Design a protein around this ligand. Structure first.
Ligand SMILES: O=C1CCCC(=O)N1
Ligand SMILES: [Zn+2]
Length: 105
C-alpha cells in the first residue's frame, strides 16, 4: 500500500512517502465556488499528471499559492491541482483522495 494510481485508468501518480502535512495535516477538506466538496491530500511531488492553463490565485485554498488544474495525463480525469508561487514549500500538489487508488509498488 505505497503508491497512488489514477482510480480511472491506473496511471502512476504519487507515493505515500511524498505526503506533505500543510498546516499540520496532509488531509484538507475544502469547497470550490460551485459548492463541490473535495477531500484533498497534499503531496510534495507527483507524476503522470497534465497541468492545464496558467496559474490563478482566485479562491486559492492555500494562502499565498496559485493553482493550476491537474488532470491525469493518461485519461483526463480531474485528480487535483498543482500549487506554486508560495513559500516553504514553493510548490506542492493537492490531490483528491477518492480519485486515487492505493496499492503495492
Ligand atoms: O476554490 C478553489 C478551486 C480550485 C483550487 C482552489 O484552491 N480553490
Ligand atoms: Zn487516469
Amino acid at each position: 500500500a505505497s503508491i497512488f494510481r489514477c482510480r480511472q485508468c491506473g496511471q502512476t501518480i504519487s507515493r505515500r512517502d511524498w505526503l506533505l502535512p500543510m498546516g499540520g495535516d496532509h488531509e484538507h477538506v475544502v469547497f470550490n465556488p460551485a459548492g463541490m466538496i473535495f477531500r484533498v491530500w497534499c503531496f510534495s511531488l507527483a507524476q503522470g499528471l497534465r497541468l492545464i492553463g496558467a496559474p490563478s490565485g482566485e479562491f486559492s485554498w492555500f494562502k499565498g499559492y496559485d493553482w493550476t488544474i491537474a488532470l491525469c495525463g493518461q485519461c483526463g480525469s480531474h485528480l487535483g491541482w498543482h500549487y506554486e508561487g508560495g513559500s516553504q514549500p514553493q510548490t506542492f500538489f493537492g490531490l483528491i483522495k477518492d480519485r486515487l487508488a492505493e496499492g503495492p509498488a
